[PDB]
Ligand binder design. Structure first.
Ligand SMILES: *CC(=O)NCCC1CCN(C(=O)C(C)(C)Oc2ccc(Cl)cc2)CC1
Ligand SMILES: *CC(=O)NCCC1CCN(C(=O)C(C)(C)Oc2ccc(Cl)cc2)CC1
Ligand SMILES: [Mg+2]
Ligand SMILES: [Mg+2]
Ligand SMILES: [Mg+2]
Ligand SMILES: [Mg+2]
Lengths: 236, 5, 236, 5
């Protein structure tokens, strides 16, 4: 822990500065540091952690997809032997992506999830676990691919179970969870019907609970509902 | 990339 | 040299892949590796080197400016004592920026410039030296500020001297040089009149030589001329 | 940021 000597509050403060400067690797490092202090995270702090890592891995995923696209094209015969370079560089980016995923999953396992007793914290962390297994699934090709897929599924399902018992259908975390779990069904599990069904049911259940919300809550909920509708339009 | 959050 | 074991051609190939994937730190590392093979760079290779580092330092400059802006605001009294965090993080970004500048300047000095015998290569490297001293000048506050400023000036001037003797006034490297040297006068040397004069004279001399150019050369030249006109519009 | 290249 290179952040071991810095105050928890200073790490959080610097994470917020890193966000403003769009320094997401720095942000993730500061938030990792904060988690490793061993105290539970607040709502705002969980959001900082998620934003930092989503941006770091988001960059790596975008790069990996570019490199994989080149690798596949260069392996379509008639292209003339590229050499090992595209594969080697795709593998380098892939390994760095897997490292980040393992880091996040490590933080969740040691010991964010086990200490998370409230619905919002537990659902948030379990959603994250599902997400970082999904990212590993996106690049997995070998012996463990199925077990990686099922780890994502298991985390998402546990999050869903808690969210349905403990949260209203408009809760943005519940909505975000269902959004991402739906994408998992479509893109990873090869289950477009399950994806569509989950997104539609989630959208309709939220619609019917919107009347209970303030103007601010309504904005947050309808933001995620729009993303559900966007995906459904993509898929149907 | 479909929408995720 | 962590790239010491990789083939020069493989490093160049990977630099091009990194560019496509927008992995500019990777790109710079691959191009550093290529330079350290000790052979002269081609036109295309010089461009890869410049693009990689311009993007890396460009990100650091953008972040530094965000952090400095926050630091200055938080030092306007009435803001309540921020603590050391903004200063510490601005200093961290500043030190990483200075490291990159020192790396580039090191490559130019060992031994790109001394081997560059043609006008285009020598002017390109001297322009780069001017640029990476300008970036150091942007953040310099202490004993060496004046010497850093004059190092940039000296590199730019030597590049100008060669460009005026050896290159037509439409040569994109000559034009780019004058563009950046003009910015140096405006932003670093506090000499807006010199900046404006240099940009105007450069623009007018190029205008008068455009008739000599092919359609492709014309596109390249007029691209940089537009940037000169943009700055002049900003400044007058 | 004025234009540089
Ligand atoms: C209490 C708690 O854990 N809060 C952190 C999560 C919230 C969720 C809502 N939010 C958002 O920015 C928007 C509205 C975009 O939605 C989500 C929903 C789910 C996730 Cl995982 C991220 C963002 C603020 C942070
Ligand atoms: C022969 C050689 O050294 N070539 C490398 C430099 C060229 C300059 C022209 N170029 C460009 O992309 C544009 C037209 C944008 O202009 C410049 C001009 C100067 C610099 Cl330093 C960069 C880009 C291709 C590369
Ligand atoms: Mg692999
Ligand atoms: Mg169901
Ligand atoms: Mg300093
Ligand atoms: Mg003059």
């Amino acid at each position: 822990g290179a952040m071991g000597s810095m105050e928890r509050a200073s790490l959080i403060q610097k994470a917020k500065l890193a966000e403003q400067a769009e320094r997401y690797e720095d942000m993730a490092a500061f938030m990792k540091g904060a988690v490793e202090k061993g105290e539970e995270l607040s709502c705002e702090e969980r959001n900082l952690l998620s934003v930092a890592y989503k941006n770091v891995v988001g960059g790596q995923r975008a790069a990996w997809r570019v490199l994989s696209s080149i690798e596949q094209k260069s392996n379509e015969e008639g292209s003339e032997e590229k050499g090992p370079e595209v594969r080697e560089y795709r593998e380098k980016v892939e390994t760095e992506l897997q490292g980040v995923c393992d880091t996040v999953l490590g933080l969740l396992d040691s010991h964010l999830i086990k200490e998370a007793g409230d619905a919002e914290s537990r659902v948030f962390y379990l959603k994250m676990k599902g997400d970082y297994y999904r990212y590993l699934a996106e690049v997995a090709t070998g012996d463990d691919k199925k077990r990686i897929i099922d780890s994502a599924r298991s985390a998402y399902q546990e999050a869903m179970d808690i969210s349905k018992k403990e949260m209203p259908p408009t809760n943005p975390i519940r909505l975000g969870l269902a959004l991402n779990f739906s994408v998992f069904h479509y893109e990873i599990a090869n289950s477009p019907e399950e994806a569509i069904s989950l997104a539609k049911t989630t959208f309709d259940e939220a619609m019917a609970d919107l009347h209970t919300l303030s103007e601010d809550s309504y904005k947050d909920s309808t933001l995620i509902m729009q993303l559900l509708r966007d995906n459904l339009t993509l898929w149907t | 990339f479909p929408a995720t959050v």
